[PDB]
Amino acid sequence: IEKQMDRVVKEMRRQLEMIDKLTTRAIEAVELLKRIYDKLT
Amino acid sequence: IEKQMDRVVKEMRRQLEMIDKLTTRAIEAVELLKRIYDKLT
Amino acid sequence: IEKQMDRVVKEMRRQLEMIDKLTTRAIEAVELLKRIYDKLTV
Amino acid sequence: IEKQMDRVVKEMRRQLEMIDKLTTRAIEAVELLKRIYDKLT
Amino acid sequence: IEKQMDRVVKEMRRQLEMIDKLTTRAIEAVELLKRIYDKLTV
């Protein structure tokens, strides 16, 4: 059971890393939106 | 089995926290788009 | 095994609800982009 | 074990459908950003 | 357990591929925001 559960945990850690990567891109988008707003203002 | 399943549940809850953070960045993006729209409008 | 699986399914459904909520915020963003575009056009 | 694992697979496929919906909203955002960019240009 | 676990890992990799596709769309969005900001600047 443990060796098999290691497989799932590994895949979960992969998904976490990808969600983190997606969040880094969202943060970049928000920062650009702030810049655009400041410019319009 | 119980100890092994606990591992998965722990990783799932970590993912929940990460999705919450991503959601807040979506909230931030919506607020900025709203501000941008209002200035235009 | 079943009782343990009950636990996992419950947590998976929490994840589903969170992705749904995230999607609701994305829809709001798309709607505002549509409003902004429509404004620029006129 | 099989009946129980079917439960997880069913929930994973529900999530897959929701991520697809989220991706369509990303596709929509990219399309509108392209339109906005074209108008500005 | 192994055969059943293969099933779960398979579905997990489907989710990974889908999240990657979503990320590519987000990157496209960021790139367009950069172009839009730059146009505003010039």
UniProtKB/TrEMBL annotation, chains C, E:
Domains: what does the record tell us?
Answer: Binds 1 calcium ion per tetramer.
* Function, in words: Plays an essential role in the virus replication cycle by acting as a viroporin. Creates a pore in the host endoplasmic reticulum and as a consequence releases Ca(2+) in the cytoplasm of infected cell. In turn, high levels of cytoplasmic calcium trigger membrane trafficking and transport of viral ER-associated proteins to viroplasms, sites of viral genome replication and immature particle assembly.
Localization annotation: Host rough endoplasmic reticulum membrane; Host membrane, Host caveola; Secreted
Give the multimer and partner information.
Homotetramer. Interacts with the immature particle in the viroplasm. Interacts with host CAV1, early and late in infection. Interacts with host integrin ITGA1/ITGB1 heterodimer. Interacts with host integrin ITGA2/ITGB1 heterodimer. Interaction with microtubules blocks trafficking to the Golgi apparatus.
Q: Which residues form a coiled coil?
A: 1-18
Q: How is it modified after translation?
A: The N-glycosyl content is primarily Man(9)GlcNAc, with a small amount of Man(8)GlcNAc.
Residues reported in the UniProt entry to bind Ca(2+): A26, A29
Q: Tell me its family.
A: Belongs to the rotavirus NSP4 family.
* Residues shown, of full length: 95 to 136 of 175
What's the protein name? Answer: Non-structural glycoprotein 4
